[PDB]
Amino acid sequence: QRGGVRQHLANDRKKIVNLNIPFFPLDRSIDRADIQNFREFGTENAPATVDAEVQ
């Protein structure tokens, strides 16, 4: 109604949060026995080499 009381406004919301993170390892080793007398399997006669397994 004209001349009477007015109205008033409201307010908004706020929020906050936190989070963690996981971890993923991976590893392998190399031993002498894996290369001693085994051929380079992809060829006729060449002996096995360490780098061929590292790669």
Binding site: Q7, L9, D12, K14, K15
Partner: protein, 148 residues
């Protein structure tokens, strides 16, 4: 792993919506009282049960009945997001508190008795005698999800 979450709703200017600001003085509307902050039987680390809008009588004891309503607590230590007073005061300690008394416009959605009850008609009529406007008539808000 439910995340640690914090929130906020509401400001100071939601119980107090306007004054009759006096020229000569600015403290005309307010009054100071001494109230028990931490219950005098609980422990130090207990958080205070006082909240903005809780009715207070002439003495510093929030009222649960119409016959003792005097003012509305609007102290700055109990506003949203202000909490850093865990354990600052020993149980049974008394702190000076501010009360709105006269010359103010008050929202009745937030006025409540000490136990959490809403303000009844008798409480309103007892608070208007001080010279206060009890509005209601508030727009509110609707957030995402509502079509409007």
């Amino acid at each position: 792993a439910k995340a640690h979450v914090a929130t906020l709703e509401g400001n100071y200017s939601d119980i107090v919506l306007g004054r009759v600001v006096a020229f000569g003085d600015t403290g005309w509307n307010f009054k100071e009282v001494d109230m028990t902050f931490i219950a005098d039987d609980a422990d130090a680390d207990s958080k205070t049960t006082l909240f903005a809008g809780v009715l207070v009588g002439e003495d510093g004891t929030p009222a649960t009945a119409a016959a003792g309503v005097f003012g509305v607590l609007v102290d700055r230590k109990v506003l949203p997001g202000v909490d850093h007073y865990i354990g600052v005061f020993e149980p049974g300690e008394k702190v000076p508190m501010v009360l709105a008394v006269r010359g103010l416009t008050l929202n009745q959605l937030k006025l409540k008795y000490a136990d959490g009850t809403a303000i009844d008609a008798a409480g309103i009529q007892a608070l208007e005698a001080q010279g206060n406007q009890v509005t209601d008539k508030i727009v509110g808000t609707q957030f995402i999800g509502s079509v409007l």
